[PDB]
Amino acid sequence: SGFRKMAFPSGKVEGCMVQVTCGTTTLNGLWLDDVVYCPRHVICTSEDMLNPNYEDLLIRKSNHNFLVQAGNVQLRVIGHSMQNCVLKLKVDTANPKTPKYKFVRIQPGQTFSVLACYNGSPSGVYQCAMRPNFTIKGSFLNGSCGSVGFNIDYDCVSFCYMHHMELPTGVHAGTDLEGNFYGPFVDRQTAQAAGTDTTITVNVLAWLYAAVINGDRWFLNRFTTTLNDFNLVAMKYNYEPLTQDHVDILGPLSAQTGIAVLDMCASLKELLQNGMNGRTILGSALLEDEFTPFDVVRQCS
Amino acid sequence: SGFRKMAFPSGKVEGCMVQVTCGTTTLNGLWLDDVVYCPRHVICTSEDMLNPNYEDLLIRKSNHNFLVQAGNVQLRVIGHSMQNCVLKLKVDTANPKTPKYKFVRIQPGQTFSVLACYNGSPSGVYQCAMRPNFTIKGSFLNGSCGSVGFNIDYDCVSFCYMHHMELPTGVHAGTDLEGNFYGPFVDRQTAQAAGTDTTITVNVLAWLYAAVINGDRWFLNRFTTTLNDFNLVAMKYNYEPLTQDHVDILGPLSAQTGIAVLDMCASLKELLQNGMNGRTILGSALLEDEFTPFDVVRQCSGVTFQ
Ligand SMILES: *[C@H](O)[C@H](C[C@@H]1CCNC1=O)NC(=O)[C@@H]1C[C@H](OC)CN1C(=O)[C@@H](NC(=O)OC(C)(C)C)C(C)C
Ligand SMILES: *[C@H](O)[C@H](C[C@@H]1CCNC1=O)NC(=O)[C@@H]1C[C@H](OC)CN1C(=O)[C@@H](NC(=O)OC(C)(C)C)C(C)C
Ligand SMILES: [Cl-]
């Protein structure tokens, strides 16, 4: 029993982290086989941060302009290419610690582990969710770019996020490992702002099911709701719509606990209306939305 | 910016986890040099669960009764001994992935990372605190015993916890790596319970500093207090006493933010006496007490591990 924000063990990713320097900029790279992936803004100069022409900047680089360090070892760059907002540096040695891996682009509401790194060395690991507004609420300082987000269901690392940018509200933006940003963001210093965020309803419901599995019932009630009436209420609290896909996905947790999905929706409606009246759920006095249904089944079963 | 509940990178510990099976019980062991450490209750059985005599149960055991697997490779046990509530299985092979490490016993209020493992395979990592009542609020299922807690300093892993037991309230009890339980707990099926717990005051203060560093300032006020006066409020709200050593440890955060510790204590006093008035601090509507001052300094400055 118990319920924690639980990350994946980070060792398989730690073995891939390197330091990349170009000019006066240092950040992290991800070393898989004979390629190092990193944010392309490592090649920006201070003159050129608003409207960098990355194709023009990159054609001017020699391989020796990229200093790649793996622990105490300098890796030799032998080629380079750009894929969207990621730079791929070909190096002369394959990483002997390369895990089984894949690249996945995730949808809002999905969670992943972040291995925050500086100068190619790991600082710590934590859980994040892709927010509905395509930001993540990370913990990132100068030099953290190139840190990655990942899941390790089974024995294969699925890389889903690479860190690029901090936005004015203190939240974070980045790309998949094919270099496509999540959300409308761009790797330029032009004015950008996150949209209004919303709460990930399906995840809140998953976490209420976790609470029941762990022995809580105080927030249950004798009411139910239609799906459309639930959504009409929930949107008044800046919750995301609940779709039939979400209802289907919650089926297994519904079966395990004996609480129909729309009955749990009625519990959530009442919690939004009333608050917790001095109580807590799984050690929180707020409705938690960064556990997915899959996360709850992973941790409770 | 940002502030998250952050665990240590777990790779140095993942390479030490093995599976240990004795009879019909499987749990995890920690393989360091040529010794595997695991809970001694691995030797109990369903006809012995209530009041085992461990002294006497181990002599009946031989080396080949312990099956130890490092991934898909069997490790041959060549000796066995007990130390307090931990079993030490000598194996014929030193772990080539043994990190620089030491065994430490932590104090209530200190935090650590747990590498939750099943069948010798690491499955998750999370951050915990040793509660004042000597339990931890972990997340553990059947088969998790032998999972360990640790901190890292520079390049050295300090192992501080091995998991043994779940108590009736769903919190957890275990030992240091010398097999001494934290708290007044024993490894057998007799009645036991977590005592009443308290809140780790110095950690709440550290987290309020983390909040100020990240721009959350609404709870600050013009007032200050004294150590004596605040400790009367702490006692009233089942908070741990604040000592002068706690005040000194927070010195760096006081200097960085301009909020002296007793100035922040006046904030905490008002929060305890008045609540949050509907507001949140670092995304929480509760006062968080599982970040130490060092945790805050480390995360806010980007310290890394070699
Ligand atoms: C890469 O290490 C770094 C990580 C940042 C630094 C502070 N926290 C982080 O997460 N990223 C950048 O420095 C990135 C490069 C951009 O210039 C090419 C500027 N970057 C920012 O993150 C800055 N944000 C920014 O300019 O935001 C807009 C576009 C909204 C103005 C940030 C340093 C203010
Ligand atoms: C080791 O893998 C396992 C971990 C437990 C399983 C459920 N969550 C965990 O944290 N520990 C035990 O199974 C342990 C062995 C004891 O018998 C020698 C019984 N154990 C318990 O954790 C049980 N607790 C218990 O008996 O509590 C008292 C002493 C208060 C009755 C638990 C499985 C009920
Ligand atoms: Cl005053």
Ligand SMILES: [Cl-]
């Ligand atoms: Cl909370």
Ligand code: NA
């Ligand atoms: Na993609």
Ligand code: NA
């Ligand atoms: Na004050």
